[PDB]
Every structure is written in structure tokens, then in C-alpha cells.
Design a protein around this ligand. Structure first.
Ligand SMILES: Nc1ncnc2c1ncn2[C@@H]1O[C@H](CSCC[C@H](N)C(=O)O)[C@@H](O)[C@H]1O
Ligand SMILES: Nc1ncnc2c1ncn2[C@@H]1O[C@H](CSCC[C@H](N)C(=O)O)[C@@H](O)[C@H]1O
Ligand SMILES: [Mg+2]
Ligand SMILES: [Mg+2]
Lengths: 192, 291, 291, 180
DNA sequence: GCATGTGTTCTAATTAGAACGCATG
DNA sequence: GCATGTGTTCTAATTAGAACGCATG
């Protein structure tokens, strides 16, 4: 995906699932403060959404997947979020002749175990990249799979899993959103 | 429907079979007169592989565990004209009280079939013929049958083996095979009642037997657990060769690998009713070579 | 010695078989093309009788334990043109160090064959044809081989299956059959090497195997006690179907009565080598009807 | 077997196996005293005796079988005596046409197990009669004919031949010459 | 109204593997 | 001059058979 000149960058058409990130996308400056309809669709109870639905919702430039943050909001099994995400992702890809850049990403608030991790990487054809966001200490970490080049291009601070295992319980995102959503307006319109 | 292929443009079929079991798919296809170009089977049970190896003399390429099959593997071993699979129902069937649903335990192996089916689908702009089919139990949670249908973008037709075999076996069948909803009709060589399946000097106490599981308890019939057979005045359970005839397999099909009564039943109890798979695959004769 | 019969004066054969086992006698007789008029089998093992009835569809009349056969029985069920049998050798063979000779234990059952043979013989002045034969192991005390020969008033002809089987099996054969002493020669269909008896994708380490017994240890060859087979690079024991092909039996002949590996080996281990019995009964088709 | 007129009762010809009964038999006067070659043949061990032997030993009128009584040691299994006895009788029985009365008897000193009793009866085609003691299987009509005292198995527990044993030989005198 | 099932687990019987044996080419 | 055999026994796993379970035509 070659970069696009600045005078040819459209606004993103974002599909967001299981978690609403409109507050974050508008903030980093990809969405209009006021949209008559909107450039971002958001659904949660996806069990009953068909391919004909996401096609009727216009084409999409980005599809964003997320698991709920560490808490007691686990009403469905952990694997359920990825499988449904992969199901909709294939509904949302454009025709084989790519008119424009089409990106996707799926994030995990450390809710998937080992067995759920290796099945996630097999389906997304990529093994994840994790972010520390721990400039203060061991403070508040999320694994992301992503199409976005700069997400899987620049390597930042590493961390041992023996230390990543203990910090999972530590809960009992200004920097995180900035870290990887950032290198997307080298492809889309920047609003501010 | 799919465009008909003239008898001369037809070419041998290349099948990807997942959770192949005892190679029922291959067995049906060659007993159906279809020339099999390639049969790629994913199976991890050593006894199951032993059967498909010995009974089919190595025409089946075994590919161990389905979860180690890559996108590269599908293009290498491809192309495929048929993708068939029956996922394990240890955590889906209602016969198990401790079942863990579609998303935990063994039930999540369904998604491997979904995953590898799309790797195998012809790319857009290539309407070469392509058929698939997925099977599972009817006795599953409503949420599972719903979600399976959503991923396959299809709704199942149920066929019960009882119309063509001597046994109750109600199973769902998602797929795109020609005439899956077609009315089921028996053949002149279907062993329709239990007496047709027994050997000499054995008497059938029923005309049709309840659903056979892996455990030896589904051979005793009903809520008074009577042995289904009488021999020389004594009550007795079914024999391994008799279980085979019930399922439509060729007799002695599981006489492999020094397997005893329990082992054969575990393999037969998990398989497909042969005459039902024969029903489903029959319209494929008009799309592939025949020798 | 005995004069030939013209083809049209030949009647179907009437045979009394004692210690019938798995009906090897009936099998070889039918496989020779001999019309079998009557086959009266004394056998007391359940699954052995199961094999005979199922594989031969009730043509064999079973007459339980031999010690309950009366003088009246022999003349009712008679007349007999052939009397065959091999007594239990667990108290005669050298393979058991706790043998009890032929005067105690189960060895005394030999005399049942002697005693019922005299009943079956045609009375003096009846020059009609009559044939008998008795088999046992060579590994017996010299005193036992002597006494048996005294009662039968005959000396045994040892035949080893090694020349027609893929297995060492040396046994004595008392009798009065035509040309027992003649040199034995193989046939086209005789599977002489172990590799001719194995299944697909299995490799045999030897050309011949040591004498098959009832125990599963007889299958590990030599002092090294190694698995006679390799498949998929791993060592493995023989399979029940392979044990059958070694003995010359039809494949799946012991897939009866939900029998596992051990059960089937117990029956085959004490059996006769089919091609040896064929060699012995081959000159009989010149005295009886053929269909 | 009908009775024989007294003037044509020839002398017996006895085959005695496992016991020399010549002393016991002569007492009741069936054998001429002194060097009578064709009156009694005795064989102690028989494991090598062929049918051609007993045929060459002249025809026989009586075949007698017995086991060792309360022997301190027997070098042979108990069943061995009956089996070898049945073996020779088939050699000794004459042609189907009956030239004369042919008799046989077997005698057990209560040394056969019950497993050996039921095989003894099956082979000798009759159940034994007990003479109070010893059990005998016999072809003789007049020892399976008449009077005999009925004793029970509790008598064989505590037990664990001049007059009593010879009482089962007297009826043979009605068929052969009485030497006195 | 109530019987049924592509299985698990528990517990009881039953069964595998090899040591054992030594006369005899 | 060492190896082989129509089996038994003992021990140790490997079963076999049934209880368990309840949503649903
Ligand atoms: N991870 C895996 N990869 C491939 N096969 C697997 C697997 N896990 C389980 N299986 C196999 O999938 C099969 C499902 S039972 C279905 C058997 C088959 N439909 C037939 O006709 O017999 C079982 O045999 C099981 O051994
Ligand atoms: N008392 C008896 N009466 C009849 N058969 C008996 C018996 N005791 C043992 N047997 C049987 O005698 C057989 C001897 S093994 C010989 C088997 C036979 N020759 C064959 O070719 O297979 C055994 O099967 C045993 O079950
Ligand atoms: Mg359909
Ligand atoms: Mg001879």
C-alpha cells in the first residue's frame, strides 16, 4: 500500500465492533466533529448481522475489533469476539480490485489465554504485537493484530511473558490510542 | 444451480475432507462410480487413519491435525472440487450433559472448517464448479445451530438415516450440493430393517434400532434396556459386523489394527450413515469423471 | 490300497469331526469342491461353534461335548465316510512345562477319539470306503506318541506347515488317508512369505514366523522377542486378519461374536494349517461327489 | 449267550492282564493241573503288545482285567489300566459270527477316581456292580443278574480274595469244563 | 406425556505382557 | 550348541456396563 498525496485523502469510513472508539477517532482527528449521518458504524450484538447488512452499510476503509476491558463484563466466552470479528471482516472486504487502502485491526485487553491466542493468530494470518504503555513503571498493555504497516513495522519496548503473566491481574488510554492509530492519516484526511 | 458440465469436459474430483474419520466420504464417492483425483484427509485418530489407509490402499493423503493446515497448504494441495467435514460433537450433542458449547472445548473446531473452506473457495471471477458440505448433530443448543448457520451463510436440511438404514440417526447438513432438500428415497439394496443386518441364526427383536453412540449402552434399546438380538434363545448385543451393516459400511470395514468390540463401536458411532452420504453425493456424478 | 470308485457311484461325504474347533475340516472340504452330505461336529467352546455356524450357515450339526456321544448316537447320526479330529494338546505339548501326559488332565480326551472311531468303523465284511485321520503336536513325550500309535494301530506322518504356510507348524498325523506320506508341494495361492499375508503399508521383518500359540508372546520372534512387523516406521505385532492369512484361513474368518484380538488368536493358535489339511484331504475327491 | 450241555463244555482259555489269577482260577477247577500251555496267558506289562500278538496267542474265551490293590506305589496312572484293557479286548474278541461264548470282566480295587469311574463305565458300556470290596464291569450274565448286597458310598470311606472275590467267578462254570 | 441421545465418569472384571520351563536337533 | 514351543500364571493396567442428564417433539 503506497502512500497517498495529501490532496487525495478522504475521511475514514470506520466499522467499529464490541467497543465504540468514535471518541478516540475524532480526537486523533479522523472524523468530523459534526456529521449529518456519520462516518462510523458501531454494533455490539452482532450474532444476527448478515453480509447483506454490512454491504448495505456502504463500503468501509477500516474495521476495528476489540474485546471488553478486564472486568466482569464477560457474558460471552472469550473466543466468541474473535470468531465473530473474523466472520464480519470477510463480509467487509471490497472487490478483488482494490479501489483504496483497506485496513483492519483487532485488539485484546489481555482477555484471551494461550489456546485462544494461537487460534487468533492462525485466523488473522499474523502473530500479535503487544504494547507496554508503561513509561511510569509497570502501569497501564494490549495485544493487537493489524493490517496497518507501521503497527507491525517499528519495534518498540519488549517485555518478558513471565512479567506479562503477573500483570494480567493488575486491573482486578491517551498513549495507547496515539501509538498505533497515529500512522493512519498518512492515508486519510486529518481534521482539526 | 451450477451450470451442467458436458460429459467430456468432466474431470476427476479433488476432495478436501476434514475430520475424515474412517474415510466415509472416499468410500461413498468410489462406490458411487466417481473417479477420485485427490482426497486430502485431516484426521488425528490413529485407528481411524489405519482404517482409511488399509481399506483404500493409500489413495488417501493424510494431513494430520486440521489446525496445522496453512493458507499455503490449501493452495499447494489444491485446487479442491469438494470440501466435506463433520466436526466433533463431544461438546455439542445433547447426549452429553457436561457439554461446553460451540466456543469452548472441542466445539470450536467447527471454525477450522469455516476457516479452511474460505481458503479453498474459488476466487471471485472463477465460476469453476465447487461444492462443500458440513454435518453435525440435531441435538445441539439453539445458539450453536444459529451461529453455525451464520458463519456458513446457509441453513441446514435435516436427513434422518432411518429412511434408508435400520437405525435412527437425525443429523443436520449445511451445504450447497445439488438437491439436498430433495425427498429422500430408499434403494433396492438398502438394509432397511435390523433383521437384514444380522448374521445367520440371529433374530432381530426390533425392526429399527435407536441411535448408536460410541458407548455400548445405546445397543440396549429403550427404558427397559433389552438386548436387541436373540441367539439360540439367549439375549445378546449387536456384533461389530452387524453395526457395520446398520451404517451401510462394507462388512469387516473396521476389522483393522487388532481393534476389539469397544474400539470398532467408537469409530462407527461417530461416522456418517453411508446411504445418507450416498443420497447427498449422488448428483455429483454429473460434474466429474466416472470410472 | 482302497479301490477307486466310478464317478457316478460316488455319493456325498458324511464326516464325523471331533474337537472341530473352527470347522477347518468342513472349510477345506468345501474349498476342495467336495459335496458334503453330513458334517457332525463335537465342540464345546462357545465362540468356536459361533464361527462354524455363522461362516457355514448351519450346514454343521453341533453335538456338544464328545463324552456324551453314545454308541446309539454314532449309528443314528451315521453312517460316516470320514472321521477327523485333533485332541487338546495343552497337556501334551512341550510348550507347557506343567503337562500331565495323555492319561491325566485333558490328554485323556484322545481316547474319546479312539473309542468313537471304533464305533464308526464299518463292521467286518463291509468293504465300503472309510477314512479317518488324527492330528497332534510333535512336541510330546515319547511315551505318549508311542501309546497313541498303539491304540490307532498306525504310525504318524509328520507334516510341517512351513512348506505351504508362512509359519513353522510341525504336527503328527495318524490316519489311513490316500498318500499321506507323499511329498508335500506348494500351490499358486499359498502365501509362502509373511509379506504375502500382511496388509497394505506394513513391512515384514522375516519370511517365516515361529509357531503361533494361543498366547500373544508367540508372535514376538526369537530370543529378541521383537514385533514381526514395521509400519509407519514403528514396530508392530501381526493383525488378526494377518494371522488368518498365515494359517490359510479366509480373511475375516474369525470376525465373529464381538471377539477381540486375544480371543481370535486363541482360536487360530490351536487350529490346523488349512493348506496342510488340504494336502491331506486332496485325494478324497476321487471317492465322493463334487459340487 | 445260551447255556451249554455238560458233555460239550470245553476248557476255558483265559487272558489275564495286570494280575496272575492262575492260582485263584485253578482253585475253582477251570484249569488242568500241570504244564497246560493253552489254558492261561499272563502279561504284566502290555505297552508294546500288538493285535497280532493276542491273535497268535490263540483264541480266548475269557479276558480278565484288574488294577493293583492298595499298592504301596503304582508306577502308572490309574486310568492307564482301563485304557490298555479296552485296547486289547478289541483285539481278542472273535469274528462277528459266534463260534462259542466269549466273556470279559474288569476289576477295580477302589483305586480309580470318580472321574475315572465315569469314563470306565462309558467305555465298557455298562455301570459297575459292586461285590461286598471291589467294583466290576463284566459281560458275564450272572454277576449282573441276581442277588447282591446294596452298600453306600459311606462304606467306601472307611475301606480307604478267597471266598468273596471268587463268588463272581462261579457262574462261569456253567459254561466250561469243571475239573475236579 | 414421557421416552430419547455422533458422551463422560465411575467402578469392577477382565484382560495384556512377559516371566517361566526345559527336552532336543 | 544354543534356540524353540496348538500354555499357564500372575500381575497391572485397560477395559465394560450402567448410572448420570434433561431439552424437547
Ligand atoms: N484437531 C483435529 N484435526 C483433525 N481431526 C480431528 C481433530 N480432532 C478430532 N478429529 C477427528 O474428527 C473426527 C470427527 S467424528 C467424524 C468422523 C467422520 N465424519 C466419519 O464419517 O467417520 C474424529 O474422528 C476425530 O478423531
Ligand atoms: N470335552 C470336549 N468335547 C468336545 N470338544 C472339546 C472338548 N474339550 C475341548 N474340546 C475342543 O477341542 C478343540 C481342540 S483344538 C483343535 C481345533 C481344530 N482341530 C481346528 O482346526 O480348529 C478345542 O476347540 C476345544 O474347545
Ligand atoms: Mg442447504
Ligand atoms: Mg500313516
Amino acid at each position: 500500500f503506497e502512500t497517498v498525496p495529501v490532496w487525495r485523502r478522504q475521511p475514514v469510513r470506520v466499522l467499529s465492533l464490541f467497543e465504540d472508539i468514535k471518541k478516540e477517532l475524532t480526537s486523533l482527528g479522523f472524523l468530523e466533529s459534526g456529521s449529518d449521518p456519520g462516518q462510523l458504524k458501531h454494533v455490539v450484538d452482532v450474532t444476527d448481522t448478515v453480509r447483506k447488512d454490512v454491504e448495505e452499510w456502504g463500503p468501509f476503509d477500516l474495521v476495528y475489533g476489540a474485546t471488553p476491558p478486564l472486568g466482569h463484563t464477560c457474558d460471552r466466552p472469550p473466543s466468541w469476539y474473535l470468531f465473530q470479528f473474523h466472520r464480519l471482516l470477510q463480509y467487509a472486504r471490497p472487490k478483488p480490485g482494490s479501489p483504496r487502502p483497506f485496513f483492519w485491526m483487532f485488539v485484546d485487553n489481555l482477555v484471551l489465554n494461550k489456546e485462544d491466542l494461537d487460534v487468533a493468530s492462525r485466523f488473522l494470518e499474523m502473530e500479535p504485537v503487544t504494547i507496554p504503555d508503561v513509561h511510569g513503571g509497570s502501569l497501564q498493555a494490549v495485544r493487537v493484530w493489524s493490517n496497518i504497516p507501521a503497527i507491525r513495522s517499528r519495534h518498540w519496548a519488549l517485555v518478558s511473558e513471565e512479567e506479562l503473566s503477573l500483570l494480567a491481574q493488575n486491573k482486578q488510554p491517551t498513549k495507547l490510542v496515539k501509538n498505533c492509530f497515529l500512522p493512519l492519516r498518512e492515508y486519510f484526511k486529518y481534521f482539526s | 444451480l451450477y451450470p451442467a458440465i458436458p460429459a467430456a469436459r468432466r474431470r476427476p474430483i479433488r476432495v478436501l475432507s476434514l475430520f475424515d474419520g474412517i474415510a466415509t466420504g472416499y468410500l461413498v464417492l468410489k462406490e458411487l462410480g466417481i473417479k477420485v483425483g485427490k482426497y486430502v484427509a485431516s484426521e488425528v485418530c490413529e485407528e481411524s487413519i489405519a482404517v482409511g489407509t488399509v481399506k483404500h490402499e493409500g489413495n488417501i493423503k493424510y494431513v494430520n491435525d486440521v489446525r496445522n493446515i496453512t493458507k499455503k497448504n490449501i493452495e499447494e494441495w489444491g485446487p479442491f472440487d469438494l470440501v466435506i467435514g463433520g466436526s466433533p460433537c463431544n461438546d455439542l450433542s445433547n447426549v452429553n450433559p457436561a457439554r461446553k458449547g460451540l466456543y469452548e472445548g472441542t466445539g470450536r473446531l467447527f471454525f477450522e472448517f469455516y476457516h479452511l473452506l474460505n481458503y479453498s473457495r474459488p476466487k471471485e471471477g472463477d465460476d469453476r464448479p465447487f461444492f462443500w458440505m458440513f454435518e453435525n448433530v440435531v441435538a445441539m443448543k439453539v445458539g450453536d445451530k444459529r451461529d453455525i448457520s451464520r458463519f456458513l451463510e446457509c441453513n441446514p436440511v435435516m436427513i434422518d438415516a432411518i429412511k434408508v438404514s435400520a437405525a435412527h440417526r437425525a443429523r443436520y447438513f449445511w451445504g450447497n450440493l445439488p438437491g439436498m432438500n430433495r425427498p429422500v428415497i430408499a434403494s433396492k439394496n438398502d438394509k432397511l430393517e435390523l433383521q437384514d443386518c444380522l448374521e445367520y441364526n440371529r433374530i432381530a427383536k426390533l425392526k429399527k434400532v435407536q441411535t448408536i453412540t460410541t458407548a455400548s449402552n445405546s445397543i440396549k434399546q429403550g427404558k427397559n434396556q433389552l438386548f436387541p438380538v436373540v441367539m439360540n434363545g439367549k439375549e445378546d448385543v449387536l456384533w461389530c459386523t452387524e453395526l457395520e451393516r446398520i451404517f451401510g459400511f462394507p462388512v469387516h470395514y473396521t476389522d483393522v489394527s487388532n481393534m476389539g468390540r469397544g474400539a470398532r463401536q467408537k469409530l462407527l458411532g461417530r461416522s456418517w450413515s453411508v446411504p445418507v452420504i450416498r443420497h447427498l453425493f449422488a448428483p455429483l456424478k454429473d460434474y466429474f469423471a466416472c470410472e
